[PDB]
Amino acid sequence: MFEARLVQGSILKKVLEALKDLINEACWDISSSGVNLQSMDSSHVSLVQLTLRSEGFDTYRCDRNLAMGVNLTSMSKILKCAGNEDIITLRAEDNADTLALVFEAPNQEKVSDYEMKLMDLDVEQLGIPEQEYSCVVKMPSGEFARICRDLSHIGDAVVISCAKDGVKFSASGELGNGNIKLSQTSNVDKEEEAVTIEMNEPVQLTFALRYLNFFTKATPLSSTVTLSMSADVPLVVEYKIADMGHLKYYLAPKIE
Amino acid sequence: MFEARLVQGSILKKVLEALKDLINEACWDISSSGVNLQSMDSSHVSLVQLTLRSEGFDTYRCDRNLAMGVNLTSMSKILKCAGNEDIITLRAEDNADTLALVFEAPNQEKVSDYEMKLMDLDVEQLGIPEQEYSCVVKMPSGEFARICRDLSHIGDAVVISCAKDGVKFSASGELGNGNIKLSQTSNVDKEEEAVTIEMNEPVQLTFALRYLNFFTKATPLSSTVTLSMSADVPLVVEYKIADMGHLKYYLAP
Amino acid sequence: MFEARLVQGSILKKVLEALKDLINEACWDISSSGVNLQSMDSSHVSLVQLTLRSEGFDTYRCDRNLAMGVNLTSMSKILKCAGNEDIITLRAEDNADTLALVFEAPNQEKVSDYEMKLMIPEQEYSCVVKMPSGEFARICRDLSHIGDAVVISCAVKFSASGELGNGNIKLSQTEAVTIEMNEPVQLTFALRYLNFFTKATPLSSTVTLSMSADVPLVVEYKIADMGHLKYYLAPK
Amino acid sequence: HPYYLRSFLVVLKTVLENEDDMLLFDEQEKGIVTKFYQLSATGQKLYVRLFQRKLSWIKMTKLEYEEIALDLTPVIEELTNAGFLQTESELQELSEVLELLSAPELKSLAKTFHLVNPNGQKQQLVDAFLKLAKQRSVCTPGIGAVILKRAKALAGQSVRICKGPRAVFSRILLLFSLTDLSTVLLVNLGRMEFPSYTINRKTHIFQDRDDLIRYAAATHMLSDISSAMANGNWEEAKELAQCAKRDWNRLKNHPSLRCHEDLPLFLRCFTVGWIYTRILSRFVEILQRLHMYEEAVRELESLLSQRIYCPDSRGRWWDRLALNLHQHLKRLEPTIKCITEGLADPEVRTGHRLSLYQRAVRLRESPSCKKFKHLFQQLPEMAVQDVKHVTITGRLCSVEELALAHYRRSGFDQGIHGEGSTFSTLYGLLLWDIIFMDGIPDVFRNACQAFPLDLCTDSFFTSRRPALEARLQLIHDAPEESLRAWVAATWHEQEGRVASLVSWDRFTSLQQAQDLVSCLGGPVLSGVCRHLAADFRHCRGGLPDLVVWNSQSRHFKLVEVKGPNDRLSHKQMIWLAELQKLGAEVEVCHVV
DNA sequence: TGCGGACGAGAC
DNA sequence: CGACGCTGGACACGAGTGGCT
DNA sequence: TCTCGTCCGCGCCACTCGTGTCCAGCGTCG
C-alpha cells in the first residue's frame, strides 16, 4: 500500500505533461526515499530520471517497493482532470494493479477519485554512472525552451559549444543557419535570470533537437535549467522540482 | 410582421452558437407571446427545448405564427461579428420573408444589418409533455461543463448517482474508472457556486456523455444549471437565460 | 555590407507575418533613401508595396543596391524567433550569398544570430475612407463568412452578397471614421484577398481605403509614421 | 496442377533433360533442384507463386492463396525447412523490414521513434529511420537494434524467397528461354503443343558455370535497363547501362570470349558479349532519349566497329548513326560517309537500306550538300515503284475495319486483318516441312521450341537451300487445287501447334485459308515465302495490313490501311513494291 | 521491333 | 470570447503488384 | 495551312495501397 498526498498538485500535473511525449509506458519505483522513474524514450536517444523525494510529499507511506508501470498518456489524461489547485494522494492497491489518484479541491466541496489500469512493463534499468561534468551552465528554463523552439524552426540538429565566456547554441539547416549564445550575466538581483557558468574544459557536442524540444515541456516545474556537458558524455538538463525532487533529461551526442 | 429587440444580443448569440451543433435543419415555432423552439437531435436520440419570454426583449410585437425556415449555421455566422455589448433587433415580414437582423453597438459609431433567407421548413411538432422529475440538482454551469469534459476522456457514459448528501458523477472506461462527487454545499454565501440537491428518492441512470458534452456548450449563457432526473424519463439540462427564458436538453438514458 | 538596425523590430516582425501569408517570394530593394519592398503576389489579383526609409532605421549603410530575393516563407520563420522587445538588425554584404540578421534582447544577456539564404502609377483618389483596422478586420471576416464579394458604397457601406444571404454594415464619423464622399462609389472586390489584407492589421491602428471608379483600391497601413504598407486591390 | 506450377515444371523438365545445361550447374544447385522436386504439391505451388512475385519480404497475412490451402503456415514452414523460404527471424536488415512495413504501420513506428515526420512519404520515413539507426544511445552499440526489434514486432510474420535457389531457378529459366517467366509462357505453356522436330545439339553456347552465371548477370542487367526504360527512369537506366559497359570492357580479353566468337550466328545471340552488345544498343537508345548525342554516335561507331556481335541489327545502328549525325548534328559529310558505307554493308537489308537510300537522296537533293559530289557517285540505285493511293472518307470502329467494310462494297467480301500475320501464316502452312526440317545442326536444342533458331537469322536460307529452293519453285508453278491441298495438309497435321509464323486464330476457318491461297495464286505466295525464308528478320514486318478478295472474281487487293496521322513505313514500302513486282495489285488506303 | 499518337521544321 | 493556428480522419486519385486457365 | 520527318509511350486489368488534399475538432493566447 502506497499513499502520498501532494498539496501542490500542479507539480505532478506538469511532471506528467513533461514526461508524456518522451515515454508512453514507464516504471514508477516505490521506495521510502520517494518515487524514481529511471525510464528512457522509445527512441533510446534520450533518458529521463524523476526522483521525487518523500520529503515534499505529506503523509508518505510505502509498505514495500512497487513497480507501478503506468501508461503515461492515460495518467496525463487523468491528471488533466485535476484542478491545478487540487491536492492529490496516490493510493496504490495493496496487491492488485489500480493506481488510485484522488483530487480534492481546497474548498473541499469536490472530490474526484479515479483508478488506473496500471499495466506491467518489462523492468529495465540503465543505471548511468554519476560522471562528473565539465562546463556546467545554469540558465532560466523559459529561455532554454525558447532557444529549442527557435532552433527547431531553423534546423534539425543543434550543436553546443561551451566556454567560460558563454555557451553557444547553433543550428544549420536547408532554410538557413543560426546561432544563439548566452554569457554569464552575474546580475545582482539574481531572480533566476543568472546565466552562471563554471568551466573546466572546452566541450563541444551535437544533439538532436526533437528530443531537446521534448525536454522543454518541463518548463512549468522549475524556473531554472542546468546544462552540464562533458565530451562523449550525454547532455544533462535538470529541473529542480519545487525543492521536493528533481527531473533530469539526458541526450546522447549526435554522430556525423 | 414580427419584431424582437434584445438588449444583450450576446444572449441570442450564445443561444444559437450553443444550440448550433446539436440540431441541424431544425424548426422554429415562435409564439405570439415569446419565443419557443423544440427539435430532436440530428441523430434523433436526444431532444432540446428552448423558451424565450416576450417580456424579456425590450420590445416585442408579433402578429401570426410562422415556420421561419432556419439554417442554424447561417444564423450562427449571422450572430458572428455581433458585439457582446451590441444591441440586436430581429424584424421579419410576413409570408416567410427573409429575417433581417440589425446590430447596433452602444457606441453607435457603427451599425450593421444582415438578412438571411428562411429555407424550406417543416414543423413536426412532437410536443413531448412536461412531467415531474425525481431529483433536481442545481450546480454551477462551469462546474458541470468541466465535469462532462473531464469524464469524456475517461468514460463514454456518466452515472448520475444523485443523493441528498450530494451528487457523484461516475465514469468507467478503458483508462480506469473515475468518480467526482459534489456534496451538499452547506455554504454560508448561498452563491451560484453552491450545489443544492432537491430530491425525494435516489435515482441512478447512465447518460450518453457525448450528448451531455453537446449540452455543456450553453455554459456561457447560465451561471448555474439545474439537472432533473426521473426513472425512465429523459434528463433535464436546464440553463437559466437572463430571466428571459429557459433552455432544456432532453436526453433519454 | 549593408546594415539596417531596428530598435523596435516588432513592426518588422508584423509586416513579415502579413507578407508570408500574402506573397511567396520577393526582393528587398535597398537604396540610400531607404528599403522598399514592392512585388507581385503569387495570386493574380493583388500586388503589395512595403516602404522603409533609411532615417527611420537606427543604422543605414547602402553603397550598392541589392535585390536580395528571399523566400518569405523561410524568412518569416527566421524573424519569428525574434522577441517582441528584441532589437532586430539586418546585415548583408554587397557580395553576400546569404542575408544575416542578429537579435539582441533588451537585457542584452542573450545574443542571437541567424543567416538565411537569398535567391502601379499613382492616381489621385478623390474619395478616401478611413476606419479602425480592427473594425475593418471584423467586416472582412464577417462578410467572408457570409459570402465572397463585397460592394462598398459611400454615404460608409459594406454590402455582403452570398447565396446564403445579404449583409450591410454602416460606419459614421464621430477609432475615427472619415469618408470624403467626393463621388458616389460602387466598387466590388473579392473578399478572399480582403481577408488576406486583414492579417496585416496588428501593424497599424488605422487602415485607409480609397475608392475611385474602375481604379484599383489600396489598403495603406501607416507603420508608426516609419513606413507604409500598400496592398493594391484590383476590382472584379 | 494449376497453370503456374505446370509452366515451372515444364521449364524445369526441359532444362534438366539437357546434359549441357546440367553440366553448366554446380552440384549444390542440382541439390536445390532435387529439393524442389522433394516437396508437397502445395509447396511447389507456393514456391512458384512467391518466385513469380517480386523478391521482397511478403507478410504472412497478405499471402492468401485459396487454391493451395486455406492455412498456409504449414507450407511456409515446409519451404523454410527446405531452404527456399526465409522466415522473419533472418530479417536482420533494417531497410528490408521498413520496406516490408505498410504506410500506416510505418507511420505508427515513426511516431514511436519520434521521427521528424510521423506522416509523410514511405521512402522519406525509411530514409529517416536509416539516419536514426546510426545514432548513439544514452547507454554510454546501436540504436537501430531497437528500431529493428520494434519494426519486426509491428510487421508480424513475414517470408522471403531465398536468393540462392532463386538464382538457380532464374538461371534455369534463362537457359530454357534461350530457345524460347513471361506471361505468355507463364500461362498456357503446359497446354501449348510444340511442333515435332528432332533435337540435334552439337555446339555449346556456354563453356563453364562461370560463363552461364556471367550470362545471367548480363541478362539481369539488360532486364533492369529495359524495366527502367519502361518505367521512365532514364537517368537510372544510363547509370546501370554505363556500369554494364564498364563490365563489358573489363571482360574484353576473357578466354571464354574467344570461343563465343566462333559460335554460329544463330547461337551467338545467347552469349555474354551478345547481351552486352544489346545493352550497348539500349545505351544508344538512352543516350538518344537523353540530350547527349555525341557519346551516342561514338557508341554507334563502337558497335559498328564489330562485325562479330549483332550483325543482324547493323541496319538499325547504321540508320540511327546517320539520323543522329544528320538531324541532331550539323555535320553531313561524315553522314555521307556513313550512308555510303551502310549501303555497302551486306547486313543492312529491307527497310533500313531504304532508309539510308532515302537519307542519301535527301542529301543529294538538299542544297546543303549540293557542293558535295561524291554522294551521287557509287550510290546503288533501287528506285521504289509508286503505289496506287485510294482515300476513303468514313467513320466507334477500328480504321482497318472501316477499310474492310469499304472493300466489301467494291466486291472483296472475304477479308481478314492479317497485319502481316496472314502472310507469315501462309508461309508457315506451305513451308512447315522445311522450316522445322531435321538435319540442320544446333538449331533445335530443347523440345519446347516454337521456331528453329536459324529462323530470324540469315543461315535459315543457307542451311536449307536445296529443299527451300525446290519447294519455292514448286509453289510458284502450282495450280489452285495443289495449293489448297498443300495448305490443308499442314492445317490438318499440325493443327493446334505453336509456331512464331503460324497464328491459327488469324484465319477464321480452313476454308478461308483455302480461298485466300487460291486467290493469291502461285507466284505471289512463292515470292512472299521466298522473301520470308531468306532474311526473315528484316522481312517479317511491313506486310500489307489488309488482304481482301471477291470469292467469285478470284481477284485480290493487298491494301495498306493508314489513318490520317499514319505513314508508310520503310518495310511497308519495300513490301508493297515487292508485291507489285509479283503481279499482285496493292494500294494504300487512307481513312479520315 | 512494330505500332499508334504527338510535335517541330520546312515549304507554302 | 473568439480570431486564429494546428495536426488528425476521410476520400479520390495514381502507382504497384499480382493473377492471368 | 500542308507535308515530311522525327520523337515517345506502349502487357493485361482489377484490387489494394501510398499520396496528396481536404475539412474540421481541438488547442492557444490575448
Side-chain angles (χ1 to χ4, degrees):
Chain A
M1 192 205 70
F2 164 77
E3 262 219 329
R5 301 183 177 181
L6 196 31
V7 173
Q8 301 183 0
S10 62
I11 290 308
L12 198 54
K13 264 184 61 143
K14 317 155 178 163
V15 155
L16 273 274
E17 197 126 30
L19 271 53
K20 164 173 51 168
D21 264 292
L22 273 194
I23 332 177
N24 305 2
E25 278 139 19
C27 57
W28 284 61
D29 172 39
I30 293 301
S31 72
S32 302
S33 71
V35 289
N36 181 22
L37 199 57
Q38 195 58 224
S39 176
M40 70 189 321
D41 69 330
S42 304
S43 304
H44 274 218
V45 189
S46 99
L47 152 73
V48 75
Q49 166 185 347
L50 180 40
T51 307
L52 257 185
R53 289 161 299 187
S54 100
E55 142 51 47
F57 301 96
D58 317 319
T59 322
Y60 196 75
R61 290 177 189 178
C62 43
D63 174 64
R64 74 211 181 283
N65 291 358
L66 305 180
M68 227 86 81
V70 173
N71 188 202
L72 251 55
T73 54
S74 266
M75 206 176 134
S76 77
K77 279 175 173 19
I78 273 288
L79 281 203
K80 205 172 306 310
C81 215
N84 302 6
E85 60 286 349
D86 303 2
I87 74 178
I88 314 172
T89 177
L90 320 156
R91 306 187 175 175
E93 199 77 10
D94 44 1
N95 305 73
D97 41 359
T98 29
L99 179 54
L101 322 92
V102 175
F103 321 136
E104 298 168 357
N107 86 36
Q108 289 182 351
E109 215 313 317
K110 214 162 61 73
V111 316
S112 33
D113 154 24
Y114 321 71
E115 297 185 4
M116 291 215 58
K117 50 186 167 175
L118 174 43
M119 68 201 339
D120 302 302
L121 295 324
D122 42 353
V123 285
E124 184 275 322
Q125 181 186 356
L126 281 313
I128 195 161
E130 305 132 351
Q131 166 59 40
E132 103 177 338
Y133 301 111
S134 38
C135 65
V136 172
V137 187
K138 195 152 150 33
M139 87 167 30
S141 56
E143 294 317 319
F144 172 66
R146 169 148 282 292
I147 324 286
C148 294
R149 301 154 194 167
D150 301 2
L151 275 83
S152 170
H153 296 130
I154 280 172
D156 194 15
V158 51
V159 324
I160 300 152
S161 307
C162 197
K164 47 182 172 182
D165 184 23
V167 46
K168 176 185 162 95
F169 309 86
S170 38
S172 61
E174 299 182 0
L175 79 97
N177 154 16
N179 60 99
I180 312 179
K181 165 187 298 153
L182 265 151
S183 62
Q184 169 158 350
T185 186
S186 72
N187 289 343
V188 278
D189 48 344
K190 243 180 194 65
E191 287 86 19
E192 307 326 288
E193 288 74 330
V195 197
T196 73
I197 323 172
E198 291 46 22
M199 160 177 232
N200 312 140
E201 104 188 67
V203 179
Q204 164 167 358
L205 318 85
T206 288
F207 293 130
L209 242 193
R210 311 166 294 274
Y211 314 100
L212 221 55
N213 279 44
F214 293 170
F215 297 171
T216 77
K217 273 189 192 308
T219 292
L221 301 174
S222 159
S223 293
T224 90
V225 55
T226 71
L227 295 94
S228 73
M229 295 138 289
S230 179
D232 206 11
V233 189
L235 163 67
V236 179
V237 292
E238 162 174 13
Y239 297 108
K240 264 92 181 163
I241 304 207
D243 314 356
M244 132 179 271
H246 84 127
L247 180 74
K248 323 203 311 183
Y249 293 108
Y250 299 149
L251 192 55
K254 276 196 63 266
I255 161 185
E256 184 177 357
Chain B
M1 297 311 299
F2 153 72
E3 199 284 330
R5 259 275 288 96
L6 186 50
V7 46
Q8 318 186 17
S10 66
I11 318 318
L12 195 141
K13 197 194 320 177
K14 324 202 181 43
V15 170
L16 281 187
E17 289 155 334
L19 189 133
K20 169 166 50 59
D21 249 9
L22 196 39
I23 48 167
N24 192 10
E25 322 189 353
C27 59
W28 280 56
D29 197 350
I30 312 99
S31 156
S32 55
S33 61
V35 201
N36 186 8
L37 291 81
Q38 156 218 22
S39 282
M40 242 181 207
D41 68 291
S42 300
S43 299
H44 281 244
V45 294
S46 211
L47 179 74
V48 62
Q49 178 177 0
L50 182 50
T51 295
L52 292 194
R53 290 201 318 241
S54 52
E55 259 89 349
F57 306 79
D58 308 321
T59 79
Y60 195 101
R61 184 25 197 99
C62 184
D63 49 354
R64 295 177 186 176
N65 68 332
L66 193 51
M68 246 87 67
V70 86
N71 172 33
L72 294 99
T73 89
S74 171
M75 333 322 264
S76 63
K77 332 328 172 277
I78 289 297
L79 292 290
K80 314 312 201 43
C81 95
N84 305 11
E85 198 48 45
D86 197 307
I87 283 84
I88 296 191
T89 166
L90 296 87
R91 63 153 305 171
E93 328 303 296
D94 39 348
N95 68 269
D97 201 77
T98 68
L99 172 58
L101 300 61
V102 193
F103 317 155
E104 41 270 10
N107 50 60
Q108 217 57 79
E109 67 173 354
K110 56 224 173 303
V111 56
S112 64
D113 50 311
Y114 315 112
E115 46 166 358
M116 273 289 172
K117 177 209 167 186
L118 309 185
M119 312 309 297
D120 301 3
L121 189 136
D122 186 17
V123 182
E124 164 283 340
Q125 191 31 259
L126 190 45
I128 289 196
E130 300 41 63
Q131 67 284 80
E132 184 53 49
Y133 280 87
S134 308
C135 78
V136 186
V137 181
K138 168 251 172 186
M139 79 217 51
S141 325
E143 202 60 90
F144 179 63
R146 198 173 216 312
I147 284 306
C148 298
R149 218 180 190 83
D150 269 334
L151 286 38
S152 43
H153 312 317
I154 89 174
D156 199 17
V158 45
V159 194
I160 37 166
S161 204
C162 89
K164 289 183 180 177
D165 55 3
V167 317
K168 14 171 175 186
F169 301 92
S170 295
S172 265
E174 294 185 359
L175 53 109
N177 60 89
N179 52 99
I180 330 171
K181 316 178 145 42
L182 297 140
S183 40
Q184 179 59 48
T185 166
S186 76
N187 286 348
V188 181
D189 51 16
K190 267 55 185 176
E191 268 331 291
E192 54 57 24
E193 190 174 0
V195 177
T196 279
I197 311 102
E198 162 42 296
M199 161 275 268
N200 55 358
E201 81 166 60
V203 86
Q204 296 272 7
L205 319 89
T206 65
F207 294 93
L209 258 171
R210 171 160 68 97
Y211 281 87
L212 209 51
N213 296 351
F214 280 48
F215 301 157
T216 66
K217 314 272 301 203
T219 290
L221 204 61
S222 188
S223 187
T224 67
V225 43
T226 77
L227 297 189
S228 306
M229 294 139 281
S230 187
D232 306 356
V233 197
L235 170 164
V236 153
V237 200
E238 149 66 20
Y239 298 81
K240 174 193 281 283
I241 319 198
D243 325 289
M244 171 285 258
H246 61 85
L247 163 61
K248 285 166 306 179
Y249 295 105
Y250 292 0
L251 158 72
Chain C
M1 52 89 40
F2 312 120
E3 163 180 0
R5 164 183 171 172
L6 201 32
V7 173
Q8 298 178 357
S10 90
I11 37 63
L12 200 31
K13 197 164 54 173
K14 307 228 211 137
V15 47
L16 222 33
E17 335 187 21
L19 283 43
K20 62 181 164 12
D21 295 344
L22 206 34
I23 198 165
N24 208 2
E25 318 81 51
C27 53
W28 279 262
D29 182 26
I30 331 302
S31 304
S32 186
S33 300
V35 174
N36 47 96
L37 176 82
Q38 69 297 325
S39 172
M40 186 39 192
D41 193 335
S42 58
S43 306
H44 304 278
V45 175
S46 299
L47 67 139
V48 312
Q49 175 182 354
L50 165 63
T51 291
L52 315 167
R53 90 209 172 110
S54 58
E55 184 54 42
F57 282 80
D58 194 14
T59 310
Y60 42 101
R61 316 301 137 204
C62 170
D63 179 42
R64 177 68 176 103
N65 291 15
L66 302 191
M68 268 167 325
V70 170
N71 168 35
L72 285 97
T73 312
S74 304
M75 164 146 169
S76 38
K77 324 182 91 73
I78 298 291
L79 205 53
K80 165 181 178 184
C81 329
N84 302 40
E85 314 313 309
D86 199 314
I87 308 179
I88 299 174
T89 85
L90 261 60
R91 273 71 178 291
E93 173 212 0
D94 52 0
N95 199 4
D97 177 39
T98 66
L99 169 155
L101 38 63
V102 173
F103 305 137
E104 34 170 349
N107 57 11
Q108 287 295 330
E109 334 166 28
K110 171 200 296 181
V111 295
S112 317
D113 164 51
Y114 326 134
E115 303 181 2
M116 91 195 88
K117 301 184 182 179
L118 78 97
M119 174 268 245
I120 299 287
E122 181 295 335
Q123 330 91 350
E124 180 34 67
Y125 289 94
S126 302
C127 90
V128 180
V129 193
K130 172 177 301 181
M131 64 221 66
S133 313
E135 178 49 27
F136 182 62
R138 194 167 214 180
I139 315 83
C140 295
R141 192 210 56 253
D142 167 48
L143 279 61
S144 34
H145 293 318
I146 272 181
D148 59 345
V150 49
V151 190
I152 58 201
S153 210
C154 81
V156 179
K157 312 166 161 53
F158 303 73
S159 61
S161 174
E163 52 95 358
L164 262 41
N166 171 229
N168 318 325
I169 186 140
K170 170 61 166 200
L171 283 80
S172 171
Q173 71 287 326
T174 301
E175 67 192 41
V177 172
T178 300
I179 174 177
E180 180 50 45
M181 304 157 308
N182 190 216
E183 48 295 9
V185 164
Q186 39 177 359
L187 300 186
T188 206
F189 294 83
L191 277 146
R192 281 187 61 259
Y193 299 75
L194 208 38
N195 67 63
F196 266 83
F197 304 141
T198 268
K199 312 171 182 188
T201 168
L203 177 138
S204 177
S205 160
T206 58
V207 66
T208 284
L209 287 82
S210 63
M211 337 299 165
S212 292
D214 66 80
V215 164
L217 164 64
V218 52
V219 276
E220 194 165 5
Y221 293 90
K222 340 290 154 181
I223 331 170
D225 306 356
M226 152 48 214
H228 67 68
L229 207 39
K230 295 182 178 181
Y231 311 76
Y232 287 145
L233 295 86
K236 319 185 93 287
Chain D
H1 286 290
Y3 70 107
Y4 40 69
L5 173 56
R6 191 189 282 250
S7 274
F8 206 74
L9 280 185
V10 173
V11 167
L12 252 55
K13 214 171 61 63
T14 288
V15 160
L16 288 213
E17 287 321 303
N18 276 188
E19 292 319 320
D20 315 349
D21 289 6
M22 282 342 279
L23 151 64
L24 253 47
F25 294 123
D26 197 6
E27 188 65 282
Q28 196 243 326
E29 299 168 358
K30 288 171 72 32
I32 297 90
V33 152
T34 198
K35 278 195 297 169
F36 178 95
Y37 279 128
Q38 267 173 35
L39 299 169
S40 36
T42 170
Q44 279 183 303
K45 280 176 227 194
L46 179 50
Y47 184 83
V48 174
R49 285 301 212 176
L50 290 184
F51 189 74
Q52 301 304 321
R53 289 184 78 149
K54 178 183 179 179
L55 167 53
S56 300
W57 294 85
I58 173 62
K59 309 197 201 15
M60 268 218 58
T61 290
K62 275 205 205 350
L63 284 177
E64 283 185 350
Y65 289 74
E66 179 176 1
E67 57 266 52
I68 47 168
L70 61 150
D71 50 340
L72 59 174
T73 277
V75 200
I76 277 165
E77 268 194 3
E78 166 190 348
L79 277 174
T80 198
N81 292 327
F84 307 107
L85 261 202
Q86 308 184 9
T87 59
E88 50 270 10
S89 59
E90 318 98 278
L91 183 30
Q92 304 305 86
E93 288 78 24
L94 183 59
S95 184
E96 308 184 9
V97 198
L98 296 177
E99 177 55 41
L100 164 74
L101 272 201
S102 76
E105 281 146 310
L106 194 65
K107 287 173 176 180
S108 170
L109 203 73
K111 190 177 53 180
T112 310
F113 281 96
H114 311 291
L115 274 312
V116 285
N117 324 323
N119 284 337
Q121 288 180 338
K122 178 177 180 179
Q123 185 54 33
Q124 291 173 183
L125 263 67
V126 164
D127 207 5
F129 262 118
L130 272 285
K131 292 172 180 180
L132 202 173
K134 291 154 199 189
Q135 288 178 26
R136 312 170 33 184
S137 150
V138 81
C139 88
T140 327
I143 294 200
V146 198
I147 299 195
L148 186 36
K149 172 174 198 328
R150 206 95 68 184
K152 272 162 65 176
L154 197 69
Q157 319 205 49
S158 76
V159 308
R160 186 193 59 188
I161 217 157
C162 197
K163 279 145 297 201
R166 169 158 218 287
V168 184
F169 291 120
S170 179
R171 256 187 284 125
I172 290 192
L173 261 42
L174 191 52
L175 273 168
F176 175 82
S177 173
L178 282 207
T179 47
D180 192 15
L181 287 177
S182 67
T183 174
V184 181
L185 257 65
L186 211 167
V187 47
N188 214 344
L189 209 163
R191 312 162 172 284
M192 313 184 345
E193 158 186 345
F194 286 115
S196 54
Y197 40 72
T198 85
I199 277 147
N200 184 19
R201 195 171 331 92
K202 184 178 179 180
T203 325
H204 289 159
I205 325 109
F206 307 111
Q207 293 134 10
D208 187 315
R209 174 164 172 271
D210 303 1
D211 203 28
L212 171 64
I213 293 175
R214 264 180 50 111
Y215 180 59
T219 309
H220 222 84
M221 192 95 78
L222 176 62
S223 179
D224 266 339
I225 293 171
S226 179
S227 269
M229 281 189 177
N231 292 15
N233 320 343
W234 294 97
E235 296 288 348
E236 333 200 25
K238 201 279 184 185
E239 170 58 41
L240 263 53
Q242 175 52 234
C243 164
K245 183 208 195 332
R246 192 169 309 108
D247 302 342
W248 164 238
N249 259 116
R250 284 180 180 182
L251 62 96
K252 185 186 178 63
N253 307 358
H254 183 306
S256 299
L257 259 57
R258 203 171 190 177
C259 176
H260 289 170
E261 291 202 337
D262 276 300
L263 265 160
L265 194 64
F266 67 99
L267 274 202
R268 204 153 57 188
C269 59
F270 309 132
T271 65
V272 48
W274 200 268
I275 291 286
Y276 273 120
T277 293
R278 291 174 58 181
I279 283 197
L280 260 52
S281 182
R282 301 301 204 87
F283 193 86
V284 168
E285 250 199 59
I286 41 156
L287 260 42
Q288 284 161 164
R289 186 71 219 270
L290 267 54
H291 321 97
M292 316 170 304
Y293 286 127
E294 303 179 359
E295 294 178 0
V297 47
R298 290 177 188 176
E299 300 271 39
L300 300 183
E301 289 178 0
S302 72
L303 289 167
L304 256 78
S305 78
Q306 75 198 3
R307 204 151 311 300
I308 76 145
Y309 291 83
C310 277
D312 82 12
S313 99
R314 302 172 61 52
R316 174 151 70 100
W317 298 331
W318 269 121
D319 203 59
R320 294 301 330 191
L321 187 136
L323 183 87
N324 300 335
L325 201 141
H326 173 281
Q327 278 78 16
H328 295 4
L329 273 59
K330 157 73 205 55
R331 37 178 187 141
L332 312 86
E333 170 237 10
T335 317
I336 286 172
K337 295 169 168 182
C338 98
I339 297 163
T340 192
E341 280 194 323
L343 294 327
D345 227 3
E347 263 320 344
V348 180
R349 266 173 309 214
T350 326
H352 287 296
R353 175 171 289 280
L354 193 153
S355 180
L356 293 174
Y357 195 168
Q358 260 189 25
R359 188 74 44 68
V361 306
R362 274 141 70 70
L363 268 60
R364 194 159 69 181
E365 166 193 8
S366 173
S368 62
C369 321
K370 262 180 196 174
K371 53 184 177 179
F372 313 103
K373 302 180 183 179
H374 39 79
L375 172 62
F376 172 79
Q377 322 143 9
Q378 311 102 17
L379 216 175
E381 295 182 0
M382 333 176 313
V384 177
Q385 311 166 325
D386 302 0
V387 41
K388 308 300 299 178
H389 275 43
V390 175
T391 300
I392 308 165
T393 59
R395 270 299 317 154
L396 173 59
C397 302
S398 164
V399 176
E400 282 69 28
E401 308 169 4
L402 330 171
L404 226 44
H406 163 286
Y407 278 100
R408 197 140 302 105
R409 295 177 182 179
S410 316
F412 313 119
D413 53 338
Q414 311 347 314
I416 318 88
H417 202 256
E419 173 36 35
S421 170
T422 173
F423 280 98
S424 305
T425 307
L426 285 194
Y427 164 41
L429 288 163
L430 297 141
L431 276 155
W432 197 283
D433 308 356
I434 325 161
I435 295 162
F436 303 94
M437 82 162 309
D438 61 356
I440 312 299
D442 321 328
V443 317
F444 297 82
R445 323 182 53 68
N446 326 130
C448 270
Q449 267 202 245
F451 69 111
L453 288 179
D454 272 348
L455 195 82
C456 279
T457 279
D458 229 312
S459 314
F460 180 78
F461 200 59
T462 313
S463 303
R464 317 152 176 71
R465 202 164 190 179
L468 221 52
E469 201 56 3
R471 163 82 54 88
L472 280 171
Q473 191 55 239
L474 210 50
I475 180 182
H476 163 78
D477 35 52
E480 330 215 18
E481 278 143 26
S482 285
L483 287 165
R484 289 173 188 178
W486 289 356
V487 154
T490 46
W491 200 291
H492 278 302
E493 279 191 15
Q494 323 304 100
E495 170 57 288
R497 294 281 151 101
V498 170
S500 76
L501 309 152
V502 171
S503 302
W504 290 112
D505 307 359
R506 165 66 43 215
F507 287 0
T508 88
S509 151
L510 180 46
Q511 292 343 276
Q512 204 165 20
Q514 308 275 52
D515 296 351
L516 172 43
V517 151
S518 169
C519 266
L520 279 163
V524 170
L525 274 186
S526 178
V528 171
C529 291
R530 177 181 285 273
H531 278 280
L532 262 38
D535 70 4
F536 177 82
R537 175 172 192 299
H538 311 100
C539 293
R540 84 191 150 181
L543 274 154
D545 292 3
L546 280 188
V547 185
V548 297
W549 75 88
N550 175 232
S551 54
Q552 163 76 63
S553 185
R554 299 284 154 183
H555 288 39
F556 64 56
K557 265 201 187 215
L558 302 157
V559 165
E560 181 72 12
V561 172
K562 306 314 290 171
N565 200 53
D566 274 44
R567 294 200 311 310
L568 262 179
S569 312
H570 295 300
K571 307 204 163 190
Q572 303 174 316
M573 298 190 183
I574 283 287
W575 255 119
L576 294 165
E578 179 47 57
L579 290 157
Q580 268 173 220
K581 271 187 46 26
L582 275 165
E585 274 175 1
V586 317
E587 58 184 44
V588 179
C589 264
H590 303 250
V591 202
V592 176

